[PDB]
Amino acid sequence: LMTNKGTFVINGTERVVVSQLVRSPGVYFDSSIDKTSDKDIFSAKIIPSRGAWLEMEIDKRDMVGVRIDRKR
DNA sequence: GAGCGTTCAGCGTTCGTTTATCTCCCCCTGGTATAATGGGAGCTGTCACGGATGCA
Numbered sequence: 001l002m003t004n005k006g007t008f009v010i011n012g013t014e015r016v017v018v019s020q021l022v023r024s025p026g027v028y029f030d031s032s033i034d035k036t037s038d039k040d041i042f043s044a045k046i047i048p049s050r051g052a053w054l055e056m057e058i059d060k061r062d063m064v065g066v067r068i069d070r071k072r
Numbered sequence: 073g074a075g076c077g078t079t080c081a082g083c084g085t086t087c088g089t090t091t092a093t094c095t096c097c098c099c100c101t102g103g104t105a106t107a108a109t110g111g112g113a114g115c116t117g118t119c120a121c122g123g124a125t126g127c128a
Contacts, residue, residue, distance in 0.1 A: 045117090051110085052114090053114080053117095069115090
């Protein structure tokens with residue numbers, strides 16, 4: 001349990017647990033530029049909380065493709 | 073010589089020794105007889121550089 005001043009007294013020593021900043025799960029769209037192509041490239045990636053991740057990259061060489069856990 | 077005075081003596085006399093017997097638990101091995109028949113699982117995002125290595 002946590003006392004009234006927000007510290008966990010474990011084994012006679014006062015600990016504190018600090019908050020932690022993490023990337024929230026969801027879809028994120030990133031735009032980039034390929035120097036060889038001379039044109040913008042767009043990607044999508046859905047990063048879940050627990051499962052394997054999935055990506056959807058468009059116009060790498062003018063076609064759209066999917067990475068199922070980046071297997072192939 | 074009397075009476076006792078020092079000091080080897082070798083000899084017993086069992087007590088001294090170290091050395092020989094003899095009784096016991098951890099430790100290792102083997103065996104169970106309905107039927108049972110291909111894993112969970114943890115990831116992921118730096119950055120540049122280069123050279124090997126694949127493939128249109």
